[PDB]
Amino acid sequence: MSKLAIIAGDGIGPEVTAEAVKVLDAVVPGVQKTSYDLGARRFHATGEVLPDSVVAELRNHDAILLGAIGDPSVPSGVLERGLLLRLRFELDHHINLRPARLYPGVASPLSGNPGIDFVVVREGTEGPYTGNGGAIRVGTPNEVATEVSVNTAFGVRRVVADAFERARRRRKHLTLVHKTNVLTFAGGLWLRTVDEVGECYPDVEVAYQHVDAATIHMITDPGRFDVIVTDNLFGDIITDLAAAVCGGIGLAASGNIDATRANPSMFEPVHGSAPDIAGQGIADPTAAIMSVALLLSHLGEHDAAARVDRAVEAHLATRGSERLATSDVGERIAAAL
Amino acid sequence: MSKLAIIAGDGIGPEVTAEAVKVLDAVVPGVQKTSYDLGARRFHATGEVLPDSVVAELRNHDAILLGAIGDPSVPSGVLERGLLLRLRFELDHHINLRPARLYPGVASPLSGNPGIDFVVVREGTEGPYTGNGGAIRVGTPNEVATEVSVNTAFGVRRVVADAFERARRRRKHLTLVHKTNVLTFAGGLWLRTVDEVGECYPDVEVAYQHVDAATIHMITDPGRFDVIVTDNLFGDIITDLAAAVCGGIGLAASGNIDATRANPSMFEPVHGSAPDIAGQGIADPTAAIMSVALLLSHLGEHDAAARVDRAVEAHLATRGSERLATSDVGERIAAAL
Numbered sequence: 319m320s321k322l323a324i325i326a327g328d329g330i331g332p333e334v335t336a337e338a339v340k341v342l343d344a345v346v347p348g349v350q351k352t353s354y355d356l357g358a359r360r361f362h363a364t365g366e367v368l369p370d371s372v373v374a375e376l377r378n379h380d381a382i383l384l385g386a387i388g389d390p391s392v393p394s395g396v397l398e399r400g401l402l403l404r405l406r407f408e409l410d411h412h413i414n415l416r417p418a419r420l421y422p423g424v425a426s427p428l429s430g431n432p433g434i435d436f437v438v439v440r441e442g443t444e445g446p447y448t449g450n451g452g453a454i455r456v457g458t459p460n461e462v463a464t465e466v467s468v469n470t471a472f473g474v475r476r477v478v479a480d481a482f483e484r485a486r487r488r489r490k491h492l493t494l495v496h497k498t499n500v501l502t503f504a505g506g507l508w509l510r511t512v513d514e515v516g517e518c519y520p521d522v523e524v525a526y527q528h529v530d531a532a533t534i535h536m537i538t539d540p541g542r543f544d545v546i547v548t549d550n551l552f553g554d555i556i557t558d559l560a561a562a563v564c565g566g567i568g569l570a571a572s573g574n575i576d577a578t579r580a581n582p583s584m585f586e587p588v589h590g591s592a593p594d595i596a597g598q599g600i601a602d603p604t605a606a607i608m609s610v611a612l613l614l615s616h617l618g619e620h621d622a623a624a625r626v627d628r629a630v631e632a633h634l635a636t637r638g639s640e641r642l643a644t645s646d647v648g649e650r651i652a653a654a655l
Numbered sequence: 656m657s658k659l660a661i662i663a664g665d666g667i668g669p670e671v672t673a674e675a676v677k678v679l680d681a682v683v684p685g686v687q688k689t690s691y692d693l694g695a696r697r698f699h700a701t702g703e704v705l706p707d708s709v710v711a712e713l714r715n716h717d718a719i720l721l722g723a724i725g726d727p728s729v730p731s732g733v734l735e736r737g738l739l740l741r742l743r744f745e746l747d748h749h750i751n752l753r754p755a756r757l758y759p760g761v762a763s764p765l766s767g768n769p770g771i772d773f774v775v776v777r778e779g780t781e782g783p784y785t786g787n788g789g790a791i792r793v794g795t796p797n798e799v800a801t802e803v804s805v806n807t808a809f810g811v812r813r814v815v816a817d818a819f820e821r822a823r824r825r826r827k828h829l830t831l832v833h834k835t836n837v838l839t840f841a842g843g844l845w846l847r848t849v850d851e852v853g854e855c856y857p858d859v860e861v862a863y864q865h866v867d868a869a870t871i872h873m874i875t876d877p878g879r880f881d882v883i884v885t886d887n888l889f890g891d892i893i894t895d896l897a898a899a900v901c902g903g904i905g906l907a908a909s910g911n912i913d914a915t916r917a918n919p920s921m922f923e924p925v926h927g928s929a930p931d932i933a934g935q936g937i938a939d940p941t942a943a944i945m946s947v948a949l950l951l952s953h954l955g956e957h958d959a960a961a962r963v964d965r966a967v968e969a970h971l972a973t974r975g976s977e978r979l980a981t982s983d984v985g986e987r988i989a990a991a992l
């Protein structure tokens with residue numbers, strides 16, 4: 319560790335990030351924390367979404383911890399395209415890491431408390447989610463709109479390697495999810511890349527599923543997954559579905575990772591800013607604290623990451639249906655370190 | 656009255672289609688049936704997949720009933736592209752109808768057998784599941800592969816207008832599912848079309864969800880859905896998920912509809928040809944027979960469909976668990992007709 323940039327952000331972001339920082343501070347004292355004003359607040363106060371100068375500041379830190387971004391006062395798509403996706407592009411966050419574990423003390427919407435323990439590695443910087451396309455004759459019966467997905471061996475190989483590495487360190491099973499029968503170009507790039515990278519991992523079993531069939535299995539047989547690798551668009555959907563089967567996006571954490579370490583990687587809870595309860599001390603910081611565990615693991619603070627994991631798991635196992643304030647949750651987790 | 660084209664097809668196609676035909680003319684008298692050897696048989700027999708002479712022949716019937724196509728026997732893609740997709744595009748099947756109901760006697764993989772009854776209207780003839788794209792420098796670190804989704808006012812309004820009608824005639828709720836914040840061109844088109852079409856349907860409440868959200872809600876709160884309208888790519892994913900939560904693709908029916916009636920529409924059970932049980936009279940013919948009810952309800956023949964429905968429901972609500980042969984299940988469905 320050493321230097322952490324903190325982007326507490328909007329609505330519930332501050333109050334959950336404060337509890338995350340507390341847990342970090344307990345397992346790794348004397349980290350330099352630097353706080354950046356980004357999102358709705360910054361957007362109103364200055365007109366700025368993501369200045370290049372702020373991006374450069376961000377580079378001076380070992381990692382970034384983010385809370386949540388967004389407010390109904392700021393238009394729909396703007397911070398999301400201009401701050402969230404832009405940071406992902408500018409910091410080369412090509413690996414979106416989305417763990418999906420079902421924990422004692424958490425209800426699944428699936429029948430019969432199945433064992434669920436997998437990880438999704440989503441490609442973060444290419445494919446359909448870059449804004450490539452256009453329209454003509456807008457607002458007429460003659461309108462035509464095109465969306466273009468660009469995929470590269472550069473991009474794909476990166477993310478696939480990382481997923482194989484994760485698979486080797488876990489249960490040695492990798493599932494590629496795509497739609498190769500219909501996206502024959504992107505799909506074939508993905509298939510061949512997994513096969514070629516797979517040559518270096520004769521220990522990892524590799525399977526393939528179409529995204530519609532994988533969606534079905536996540537509901538009927540989620541125990542079959544160890545590591546899933548996929549693209550930006552399909553990953554967007556299946557990481558949220560994973561979260562849902564593991565008891566909701568409110569209990570999910572995310573890494574946005576440049577595996578070359580050339581740039582600092584960013585960690586956050588998956589949930590959003592929930593402005594209707596902002597400042598009230600209701601928001602659960604468990605997700606934010608679980609993102610701290612990801613961050614620590616990424617920085618090689620593995621013993622300290624295990625400690626946070628164990629302390630989250632302990633909290634979830636005894637919380638029950640008790641009404642717990644944001645700071646009561648943070649205290650319970652802290653006391654279990 | 657009616658001319659039906661029948662393409663039993665491959666593997667278990669013949670067997671479940673035999674039942675559906677049996678059900679059919681036992682509720683509508685003068686159905687003039689024509690058999691079509693299309694699929695693996697025809698291919699192996701002749702080399703033919705779907706000659707133009709044959710499409711022109713199909714156009715002279717009032718509907719098409721299909722069982723299944725595909726065999727490992729036939730090289731990947733030959734029939735799916737050259738028969739199945741080609742028929743969809745040639746016959747202008749712009750509406751893909753995928754009803755989603757959890758019936759009595761059917762166990763859902765979701766918690767607490769919840770209320771689920773909705774319909775998915777999926778755009779059928781545009782988007783990226785068209786084959787539009789390419790690659791350069793294949794098989795090198797410099798490989799780049801593109802997929803292109805073409806979306807039109809023409810294609811979109813038709814599908815959307817058909818959805819609003821389905822909504823009116825049901826619980827007057829329509830959900831548009833897309834990803835408008837990042838597929839900004841396609842997204843904008845779909846949004847604006849739903850708004851504009853919806854001004855002849857003030858009876859219909861209109862809701863928007865991003866596809867990632869919809870997938871979460873399909874598993875945590877599927878009861879909030881009546882009609883879903885979406886594009887080809889997102890519909891392909893959400894249709895399979897709806898089936899799963901309503902007890903499986905094995906119990907799902909699909910309409911492929913030219914809502915201008917210039918071409919005959921096609922109806923089929925969702926499941927494939929299952930080469931592994933071809934000819935053992937094991938295959939369950941229920942969905943094939945559910946596909947007849949959509950074929951009927953589309954041809955204006957409400958009461959024969961209104962019936963046939965009930966005979967299927969009876970079948971499912973009373974089957975218990977005993978292994979039934981194809982022809983048995985077929986015979987059972989008669990009774991309540």
Ligand SMILES: [Cl-]
Nearest residue numbers: 386387589590
């Ligand atoms: Cl956020």
Ligand SMILES: [Cl-]
Nearest residue numbers: 415437484488
């Ligand atoms: Cl991992």
Ligand SMILES: [Cl-]
Nearest residue numbers: 554557572588
């Ligand atoms: Cl996201």
Ligand SMILES: [Cl-]
Nearest residue numbers: 774821822825
């Ligand atoms: Cl309907």
